[PDB]
Symmetry: D2
């Protein structure tokens, strides 16, 4: 499978979206799993999940790697509401447009906030919920905020450069030897190709600070069976938020990977793929 | 499979053990997995693991559910050293006696301490290590000690009664409806059948307090791939010890079950069996 | 100072209170400090704070040890709303009735919930806020709930007995040698004297469960300078809630006493008195 | 009081120190309190504690602000043993040289490690122990290591520059408006004046990594009454280590300041001074 062979576009119409262009990459034809990426500069569905799409398709799922509004090849946007909710509306718009009745959701960081908001707003449209270090869940009981990684994420948004991208990635990943020229150049190309996304994200952050993303108080509403994953060494979203989710969602379990930053699906791809596929099949 | 059809005995000879009788239950004939039980009154291999033995045997393993010294049908003993280490020596004695070169270990509570000590003392004789809320790992950062469950465990040892057994089990299990007459009577029979074990455990606890079981300082020695499981609602061993293990063992991962006490292999048997079998096969 | 010489009554009129009798003990004549007790069977202002009233009066404060509605010598009541808020309304009623414009509040456990609700509802009427292990602040990130102490509190409410009172107190206090016959008999007399309070508390708990007391989401509203105290060994309210308060209240500090249960003002009275008096004078 | 008027030197002779020059600043003449600074580039006694020396002297103490070996105006040194222990030996050498029988110790970060090692090695020579976010106490249960602040500390040691110093200080302090030109230039002058200290610290860190400083296992030996302080927002040493100390030292208490980095004695100087002076007088 390749980015080019899987690349598709769909115009969505949902709440404050009118003929809004959403890019996604699709492979497979069984039960739909939508995978949702984080909010760092240059993020997109394919680069976030290219170690997972193949195994999930082999397991018999239809995988949609969605570009969230204001990222990658999806349309530019300035949001005045918290991104989790807006992104979630875009997932519903995509699903309606493609006649998908129900989807399993996989979401890391911002994508985890998206998946949470979706499970809250559209409970009849979600199957199972897989959350990898979701962002915006309020203060940590131990970690000073903004977290180290978030500071670097802001700095890259405001002053984008190849060196700052590398600094960010070194914080993002536990194992530094995963940062090849291919990963760096690829992410750098996504940033260079869409400078408008960077300035818009910063404007959006002014209109709706991270505190506005905190849906903690509503977690008890979630009826989806939930699989929470965390990197032990995540410097972007605090480990104790894995416990917050585990205590507040009805049917949840928590899996924490050692020697792992925010990108468990990349750093521990084999174990991640087996666990989540097993959860989707049998939980 | 039944307790009676699987029941076996072997005399062990290791360090301070001479012709010491060890009871165990064995089924299957592939790779050996030894499963080790907790230290509560009436504990034994078969009752601790009777929801897991079948699935593991179906997966192709040879399962040995071991009675630790001073429990169930194994010989009576008063230990002056911490139980984890003494139990571990008994596992080595059993393995030598049965010509088992290497075993995967599964250990809950006291059995988790046993498995840890084994991995430390006999690294060449362990495959993978599965730890379910191991006891004796020093103070908690949050939980006052002795933990609620430990107080009840002591009270049952000192003043054994059917009502006190029921109180203990209600604390042991998250889901109270799992406490059937069959579970209660069975555990009660094990207590009635071997009163000597109860008095000996209390004597042993005087000679070697729980503080003496703490092997935290040596966790960095463990080279076994390790799967740590915890019940979110464990009132016997503190949840933050799952983090302690995850930070200090080289290759570890942590899985926490919601709505689960100390007995994850019983309360969440299906998920537990799938996760651990997958870990043994693929990690 | 004695309970009898300080004992006073006042009829209050506030929201759902009409000619409702509030008992309190008052000494001193400077700045008013109102001290608010926990919700255990037989609790009251004088017994909760009799090691603190003298030192605070010597420091120049007017101390009012308030009996909350449905406790001690205050009127009986069945509450259908969370107790923190109802208690807080009663504090306002007392203050209006006595022409007290502003008070410093000291609150342990339920009394801490009372003080929090007061700071939220009547910000113009509070000086400084002193919180000792306040109850009802939602789930713990580490402690299974109901906490051990809460289970005993329920059992004493439902099946009051001298032995069960002693069991509760042994959990309540770190240092068991503080449980003299005088403390036990005194608390027992308060329970025997007002059986109606016990049945009413249980009825109230059915109408408004502990989950309904959780004011976490509003903590950011508190403008009072806040001093949070915790017992390290508190088995009633979880230590991580001290962090929850410290992260969410604007101007807070946290002091944790070693070898201390829920009753820091009793177990560490000298240090407690010096710290809080210093805070009231200088913070 | 000024740095110049208080500045003194003494040659020490203790274990591996022979005629080793120690600089310190001394004022007052009552009970001796020795204050020990952190290990960041340009650290020294006077700059670390210049908001505390006056109030402590006014309270009646003799204050010695010690420069640790390899810092400020004390002699250069390359250490092959963990710095806490070596620094502690230097404190004993200073005390012997000055005929001080017993001292109260105040230690932040590295200075907290120094004070801990001193309390362990020379229990007969310490009064009370005041610890402000001591470093080197092993892994955190929540914080990835090296902590954000430590990474910046290394970067400043390796590539010293005024901009990198400012970056470090912005992380060091919660309130950025405390970073005046005076603080920056002063710290910068200390770095420029002694480049040898920077290269030696890095060499020492290679010979004795931070893991070698971990004295956790011996904390139970400490008989000194201990006051542990932490900044809630400390990005150099993890907040859960405050709990580690509180659980493992016999007579300890923990005070956590909101809106505070590693430098509580500077950011919350008034409250810090009152608390510690009160502790020294009355605990
Ligand atoms: O690949 C990415 O999207 C990435 O590098 C970082 C994402 C961070 C992120 O989504 C985040 C959002 C809010 C709070 C914390 C974290
Ligand atoms: O089935 C059992 O063995 C049981 O009920 C409890 C075991 C507790 C246990 O092994 C334990 C030992 C040390 C510390 C904490 C827990
Ligand atoms: O003296 C007392 O009031 C006492 O023994 C216990 C009080 C517990 C209490 O107020 C509480 C309320 C809600 C949640 C946790 C704790
Ligand atoms: O003023 C200073 O010394 C400073 O900026 C930082 C000190 C950090 C420090 O002593 C430290 C040492 C080991 C581990 C963590 C922290």
């Amino acid at each position: 499978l390749t980015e080019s062979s899987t690349s598709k576009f769909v115009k969505i119409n949902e709440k404050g979206f009118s003929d809004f262009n959403i890019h996604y990459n699709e492979a497979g034809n069984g039960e739909t799993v939508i995978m949702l990426h984080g909010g760092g500069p240059g993020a997109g569905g394919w680069s976030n999940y290219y170690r997972n799409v193949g195994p999930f398709v082999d397991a018999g799922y239809r995988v949609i790697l969605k570009d969230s509004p204001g990222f990658n090849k999806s349309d530019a946007v300035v949001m005045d509401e918290q991104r989790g909710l807006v992104n979630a509306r875009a997932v519903k718009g995509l699903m309606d447009a493609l006649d998908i009745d129900r989807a399993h959701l996989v979401g890391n960081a911002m994508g985890g906030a998206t998946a949470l908001n979706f499970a809250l707003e559209y409970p009849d449209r979600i199957g199972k919920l897989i959350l990898m270090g979701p962002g915006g869940l309020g203060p940590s009981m131990f970690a000073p905020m903004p977290m180290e990684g978030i500071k670097l994420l802001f700095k890259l948004y405001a002053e984008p450069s190849y060196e700052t991208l590398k600094q960010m990635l070194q914080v993002f990943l536990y194992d530094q030897s995963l940062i090849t020229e291919e990963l760096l150049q690829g992410r750098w190309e996504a940033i260079q190709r869409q400078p408008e996304h960077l300035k818009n994200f910063l404007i959006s952050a002014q209109k709706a600070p991270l505190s506005t993303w905190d849906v903690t108080a509503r977690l008890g509403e979630i009826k989806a069976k939930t699989f929470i994953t965390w990197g032990r060494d995540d410097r972007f979203v605090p480990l104790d938020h894995g416990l917050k989710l585990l205590w507040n969602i009805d049917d949840a379990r928590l899996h924490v990977f050692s020697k792992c930053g925010q990108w468990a699906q990349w750093e521990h791809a084999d174990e991640f793929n087996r666990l989540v596929i097993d959860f989707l099949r049998h939980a």
